Amino acid sequence: VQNVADVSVLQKHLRKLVPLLLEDGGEAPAALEAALEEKSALEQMRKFLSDPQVHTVLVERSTLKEFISYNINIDIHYGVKSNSLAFIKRTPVIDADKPVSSQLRVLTLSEDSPYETLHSFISNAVAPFFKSYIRESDKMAPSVEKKIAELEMGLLHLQQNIEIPEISLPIHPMITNVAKQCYERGEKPKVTDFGDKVEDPTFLNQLQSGVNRWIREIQKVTKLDRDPASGTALQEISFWLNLERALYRIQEKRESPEVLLTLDILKHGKRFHATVSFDTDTGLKQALETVNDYNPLMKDFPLNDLLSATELDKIRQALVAIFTHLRKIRNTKYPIQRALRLVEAISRDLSSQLLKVLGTRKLMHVAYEEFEKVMVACFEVFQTWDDEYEKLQVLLRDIVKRKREENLKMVWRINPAHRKLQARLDQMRKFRRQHEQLRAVIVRV
Amino acid sequence: AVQNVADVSVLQKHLRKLVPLLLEDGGEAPAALEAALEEKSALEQMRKFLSDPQVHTVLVERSTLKEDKEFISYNINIDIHYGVKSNSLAFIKRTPVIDADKPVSSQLRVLTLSEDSPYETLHSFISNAVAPFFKSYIRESKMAPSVEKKIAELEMGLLHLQQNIEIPEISLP
């Protein structure tokens, strides 16, 4: 509120806890001394501790630029290079009138990535206080804990996705030079713009090698693929999605007027197979074409409907929507091997979601009759998943009858994990039935 | 990140530098905080949070319990409890295998369970820096939009159930 902390208060707080929340503890380190001798730290501390609006005293002593640099401010950034220590005030303002450091709470925003540090801090203490307040010590705390756990799982899955990286193209300098020259006036280059650089076979071969290394960068993305059974189906959806993302980005990088212009430079400069040996060496066309092929299949998938929503009706309707997304195979031309691999990964994901639902069922914590009923419900959901797999096999057989000359491998070579889950549920129900049988034996004998 | 699990010595020093921070005016922590940190409870808890794979969160909730000044006893549990009258310092091990001589921030990511309720502290921390962190991170180049939407919804509901009175003002700068 009115506890306006000066530069000396921020200096003492830095010398007492900046190393404990940013380095290997102790007293004022180099970054803590720099924060103690800075006015920006005093301003950010007064705005996030004195003022009741901001509550996170972000001691952004990011270990970079080792010799950390306290880039303390009122805003935040979940970067992979900002090892901040946000002293989030427990109250609306960290009033130093009370115990100077106890006015807030350390929240070490580590050097992990956005999804990485997000899932880390979220799964570390977000859902904990909300769930502990919902159960221990009403319509908002439990749902808040559920949303915090969902955010932790979402950032984790984002980090655990099959995300596609970025690959660039190194442009030759004379291209850029003459390009700037044309940008001086209102002009774009041409073949005769370079004068006789198109007649410089050395320079022509320099750009030939440039075009070559650019297709090498292309090739780094063309052959980049992954089996649909690798990991989970969720990773395959994120995989193909980020694939198309980077495909279009690198595609536009290729489609820049300088690259195409240099192709014109070469071919009109008698290096007659620039676009020939260039376009033929590109798999980008076929890769984007393949994403267009598998476009409705990767779309509308019930990933979060089952993974993020592991409830009973959520997994049932999730498997129904997964079968509906699988029904788009008539519009996606999924390869029988790719479909079988993706079905295996989908069954593995169904088994993991069934495991989460089983953990959310608590047959052991419930009675033997209740354990058998919960096992019957889990086995019924597993039977519905196997029925969805049966409908998928029916559609696979329809695709087999369609492309019998080429695609007729609908042998249903996908491990139905729902059957194993239902069998294990039957084993648990058998243990519960033995418990009920012994209870009836005690009530009779 | 390091097989040298933080035992009662490393956790005791971490409590003497963190429970003192998130539970007092820096310097030295409370007597119950260092006593529980040096005890076998926090020894096994920190050793599991820095040695076991499934155990990675070490919430040393330095709860300012009454009937003792408020004794900020560092209950080193796994998850953060219901922060009401607690001066909790949930310095959860940033890595499932934390160190003993490395940086405390890189090995034990701090967090807490503030004295405010779950909705109040959730809205406070969320609107204070969770929106800006992910905001600038996504702005500096999708699951991030869904996570940001769920975060905004959580902050909105936390602000709704946070203050039942809710008498704000509108300034015109």
List the SSEs and their pairings:
The structure is cut from a larger assembly and holds 2 copies of chain A.
Chain A: H1 7-22, H2 30-36, H3 39-50, E1 56-59, E2 61-62, E3 69-70, E4 84-89, E5 104-109, H4 114-135, H5 141-159, H6 173-184, H7 201-222, H8 233-254, H9 257-268, H10 274-279, H11 284-293, H12 295-298, H13 303-306, H14 312-326, H15 336-359, H16 368-402, H17 417-444
Antiparallel strand pairs in A: 1-4, 2-3, 4-5
Helix pairs in contact in A: 1-2, 1-3, 4-5, 7-9, 8-11, 14-16, 15-16, 16-17
Please sum up the structure shown.
Chain A: It comes from Homo sapiens (Human). This is part of a larger assembly, with two copies of chain A. With 445 residues, chain A is mostly helical.
Q: What does this entry look like structurally?
A:
The structure is cut from a larger assembly and holds 2 copies of chain A. The first copy, chain A, is mostly helical. Chain A has helices spanning 7-22, 30-36, 39-50, 114-135, 141-159, 173-184, 201-222, 233-254, 257-268, 274-279, 284-293, 295-298, 303-306, 312-326, 336-359, 368-402, 417-444; strands at 56-59, 61-62, 69-70, 84-89, 104-109. The first copy, chain A, has a 3-stranded antiparallel sheet. In chain A, strands 2-3 form a two-stranded antiparallel sheet. In chain A, a hairpin with a 6-residue loop joins strand 2 (61-62) and strand 3 (69-70). In chain A, helix 16 (368-402) packs antiparallel against helix 17 (417-444). Chain A is flat. In chain A, 44% of the residues are buried. At the A-B interface, helix 1, strand 4, strand 5, helix 4 and helix 5 of A face helix 1, helix 4, strand 4, helix 5 and helix 6 of B. Chain A: It comes from Homo sapiens. Chain A: Residues 143-164, 417-440 form a coiled coil. Chain A: Belongs to the dynein heavy chain family.
